[PDB]
Amino acid sequence: MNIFEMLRIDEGLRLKIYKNTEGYYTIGIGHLLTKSPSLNAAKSELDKAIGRNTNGVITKDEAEKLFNQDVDAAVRGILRNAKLKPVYDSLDAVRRAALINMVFQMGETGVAGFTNSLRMLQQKRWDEAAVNLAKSRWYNQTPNRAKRVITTFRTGTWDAYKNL
Ligand SMILES: [Cl-]
Ligand SMILES: [Cl-]
Protein backbone atom coordinates (compact mmCIF):
# COMPACT_ATOMS: atom_id res chain seq x y z
CA MET A 1 0.00 0.00 0.00
CA ASN A 2 1.05 3.55 -0.69
CA ILE A 3 -0.55 7.07 -0.89
CA PHE A 4 -1.63 6.47 -4.43
CA GLU A 5 -3.42 3.26 -3.78
CA MET A 6 -4.79 4.66 -0.59
CA LEU A 7 -6.37 7.67 -2.17
CA ARG A 8 -7.59 5.67 -5.15
CA ILE A 9 -9.63 3.56 -2.70
CA ASP A 10 -10.94 6.64 -0.92
CA GLU A 11 -11.87 8.71 -3.95
CA GLY A 12 -12.64 6.11 -6.60
CA LEU A 13 -12.21 6.79 -10.35
CA ARG A 14 -14.91 8.44 -12.65
CA LEU A 15 -14.27 9.49 -16.16
CA LYS A 16 -17.27 11.80 -16.50
CA ILE A 17 -17.90 15.01 -14.49
CA TYR A 18 -19.77 14.14 -11.29
CA LYS A 19 -20.76 15.75 -8.09
CA ASN A 20 -18.64 14.96 -5.07
CA THR A 21 -20.00 14.44 -1.49
CA GLU A 22 -20.30 18.23 -1.04
CA GLY A 23 -22.22 18.55 -4.31
CA TYR A 24 -19.23 20.04 -6.22
CA TYR A 25 -18.22 19.22 -9.76
CA THR A 26 -15.37 16.85 -9.84
CA ILE A 27 -13.69 14.36 -12.18
CA GLY A 28 -11.14 11.54 -12.15
CA ILE A 29 -9.67 10.56 -8.81
CA GLY A 30 -11.24 13.26 -6.66
CA HIS A 31 -9.99 16.16 -8.77
CA LEU A 32 -12.27 19.03 -7.80
CA LEU A 33 -13.13 21.23 -10.71
CA THR A 34 -15.07 24.10 -9.21
CA LYS A 35 -17.41 25.03 -6.38
CA SER A 36 -19.59 26.82 -8.82
CA PRO A 37 -23.05 25.58 -9.40
CA SER A 38 -22.53 25.79 -13.13
CA LEU A 39 -21.76 22.79 -15.27
CA ASN A 40 -20.46 25.06 -17.94
CA ALA A 41 -18.04 26.55 -15.49
CA ALA A 42 -16.95 22.98 -14.71
CA LYS A 43 -16.54 21.97 -18.35
CA SER A 44 -14.48 25.03 -18.86
CA GLU A 45 -12.22 24.31 -15.89
CA LEU A 46 -11.97 20.76 -17.13
CA ASP A 47 -10.76 21.70 -20.68
CA LYS A 48 -8.28 24.15 -19.24
CA ALA A 49 -6.87 21.43 -16.89
CA ILE A 50 -6.60 18.82 -19.69
CA GLY A 51 -5.63 21.16 -22.49
CA ARG A 52 -8.34 19.98 -24.95
CA ASN A 53 -12.02 20.17 -25.63
CA THR A 54 -13.18 17.32 -23.48
CA ASN A 55 -16.85 17.73 -23.55
CA GLY A 56 -16.85 16.55 -19.89
CA VAL A 57 -15.27 13.17 -20.55
CA ILE A 58 -11.60 12.22 -20.02
CA THR A 59 -9.61 9.09 -20.39
CA LYS A 60 -7.93 6.96 -17.76
CA ASP A 61 -4.51 8.20 -18.51
CA GLU A 62 -5.72 11.81 -18.25
CA ALA A 63 -7.30 11.01 -14.88
CA GLU A 64 -4.06 9.52 -13.68
CA LYS A 65 -2.17 12.53 -14.81
CA LEU A 66 -4.35 14.96 -12.79
CA PHE A 67 -3.98 12.52 -9.88
CA ASN A 68 -0.18 12.61 -10.00
CA GLN A 69 -0.26 16.36 -10.12
CA ASP A 70 -2.71 16.58 -7.19
CA VAL A 71 -0.66 14.30 -4.98
CA ASP A 72 2.44 16.22 -5.75
CA ALA A 73 0.73 19.46 -4.97
CA ALA A 74 -0.61 18.11 -1.64
CA VAL A 75 2.88 17.13 -0.50
CA ARG A 76 4.36 20.48 -1.56
CA GLY A 77 1.54 22.27 0.19
CA ILE A 78 2.37 20.40 3.41
CA LEU A 79 6.04 21.16 3.05
CA ARG A 80 5.51 24.81 2.56
CA ASN A 81 3.01 25.12 5.41
CA ALA A 82 4.60 26.32 8.64
CA LYS A 83 1.97 24.54 10.62
CA LEU A 84 2.00 21.34 8.72
CA LYS A 85 5.57 20.82 7.96
CA PRO A 86 6.74 20.14 11.47
CA VAL A 87 4.06 17.55 11.99
CA TYR A 88 4.78 15.73 8.73
CA ASP A 89 8.50 15.73 9.50
CA SER A 90 7.87 14.15 12.91
CA LEU A 91 5.80 11.24 11.64
CA ASP A 92 6.61 7.82 10.23
CA ALA A 93 5.93 6.89 6.56
CA VAL A 94 2.48 5.39 7.08
CA ARG A 95 1.21 8.24 9.16
CA ARG A 96 2.61 10.74 6.69
CA ALA A 97 0.31 9.18 4.08
CA ALA A 98 -2.66 9.72 6.36
CA LEU A 99 -1.81 13.45 6.58
CA ILE A 100 -1.42 13.72 2.81
CA ASN A 101 -4.87 12.10 2.44
CA MET A 102 -6.48 14.70 4.66
CA VAL A 103 -4.76 17.52 2.81
CA PHE A 104 -5.81 16.17 -0.52
CA GLN A 105 -9.44 16.03 0.63
CA MET A 106 -9.73 19.27 2.46
CA GLY A 107 -6.85 21.51 1.53
CA GLU A 108 -3.87 22.77 3.40
CA THR A 109 -5.89 25.50 5.09
CA GLY A 110 -8.58 23.14 6.33
CA VAL A 111 -6.06 20.72 7.78
CA ALA A 112 -3.95 23.47 9.39
CA GLY A 113 -7.11 24.31 11.38
CA PHE A 114 -6.97 20.99 13.39
CA THR A 115 -4.60 22.60 15.74
CA ASN A 116 -5.19 20.45 18.78
CA SER A 117 -5.04 17.14 16.79
CA LEU A 118 -1.84 18.27 15.06
CA ARG A 119 -0.22 18.91 18.40
CA MET A 120 -1.25 15.51 19.61
CA LEU A 121 0.05 13.83 16.51
CA GLN A 122 3.31 15.70 16.88
CA GLN A 123 3.47 14.45 20.46
CA LYS A 124 2.78 10.89 19.36
CA ARG A 125 -0.36 10.70 21.52
CA TRP A 126 -2.11 8.33 19.09
CA ASP A 127 -5.32 7.45 20.92
CA GLU A 128 -5.83 11.00 22.01
CA ALA A 129 -5.41 12.38 18.56
CA ALA A 130 -7.85 9.85 17.16
CA VAL A 131 -10.49 10.96 19.59
CA ASN A 132 -9.87 14.62 18.91
CA LEU A 133 -9.92 14.05 15.12
CA ALA A 134 -13.36 12.43 15.31
CA LYS A 135 -14.90 15.58 16.82
CA SER A 136 -15.16 17.37 13.48
CA ARG A 137 -17.51 18.05 10.66
CA TRP A 138 -15.14 15.97 8.54
CA TYR A 139 -15.80 12.88 10.54
CA ASN A 140 -19.61 13.43 10.78
CA GLN A 141 -19.90 14.10 7.06
CA THR A 142 -17.70 11.28 5.70
CA PRO A 143 -17.40 8.91 8.57
CA ASN A 144 -16.30 5.75 6.77
CA ARG A 145 -13.43 7.49 5.11
CA ALA A 146 -12.60 9.56 8.24
CA LYS A 147 -12.44 6.25 10.26
CA ARG A 148 -9.99 4.76 7.80
CA VAL A 149 -7.63 7.75 8.00
CA ILE A 150 -8.02 8.02 11.77
CA THR A 151 -7.21 4.29 12.21
CA THR A 152 -4.15 4.87 10.19
CA PHE A 153 -2.96 7.62 12.45
CA ARG A 154 -3.80 5.55 15.50
CA THR A 155 -1.99 2.38 14.51
CA GLY A 156 0.60 3.37 11.96
CA THR A 157 -0.35 0.35 9.81
CA TRP A 158 -2.43 0.05 6.63
CA ASP A 159 -4.89 -2.32 8.23
CA ALA A 160 -8.01 -0.12 7.55
CA TYR A 161 -7.25 -0.38 3.89
CA LYS A 162 -6.24 -4.00 3.62
CA ASN A 163 -9.30 -5.71 2.04
CA LEU A 164 -10.50 -2.73 -0.15
CL1 LIG B 1 -5.06 21.37 -12.93
CL1 LIG C 1 -17.27 8.24 3.96
Neighbours of 43 (CB within 10 A): 20
Give the Å distances, CA to CA, from 39 to 21, 49, 52, 115: 16, 15, 17, 35
Residue 47: CB partners within 8 Å, gap ≥ 6?
53, 54
Q: What are phi and psi of 122, to 5 degrees?
A: -55, -35
Query: For residue 146, which ligand has an atom nearest its CA?
Result: 2
Neighbours of 38 (CB within 10 A): 10
End-to-end CA distance of the chain: 11
Tell me, rounded to whole angstroms, the distance of Cα 25 from its chain centroid.
Answer: 16
Give the Å distances, CA to CA, from 163 to 148, 158, 159: 12, 10, 8
Q: Which domain holds residue 23?
A: 1-164
Q: Are 46 and 67 in contact (CB under 8 A)?
A: no
Please state how this structure was obtained: X-ray
If 0-12 CB within 10 Å is exposed, 13-18 middle and 19+ buried, where does residue 2 land? exposed
How far does residue 162's CA lie from ligand 1's centre (Å)?
30
- Residue 44 C-beta-side C-alpha neighbours within 13 Å: 8
Give me the resolution in angstroms, 1 decimal.
1.8
Query: For residue 139, which ligand has an atom nearest its CA?
Result: 2
Q: How many whole angstroms separate alpha carbon 161 and alpha carbon 151?
A: 10
How far does residue 53's CA lie from ligand 1's centre (Å)?
15
Q: Which residues are bridge partners to 18 per DSSP?
A: 26
CATH number at residue 81: 1.10.530.40
Number of domains in the chain: 1
Q: At 31, which amino acid appears? A: H
Q: Which H or E run includes 14?
A: strand 14-19
Q: How many whole angstroms separate alpha carbon 147 and alpha carbon 134?
A: 8
Query: For residue 66, which ligand has an atom nearest its CA?
Result: 1
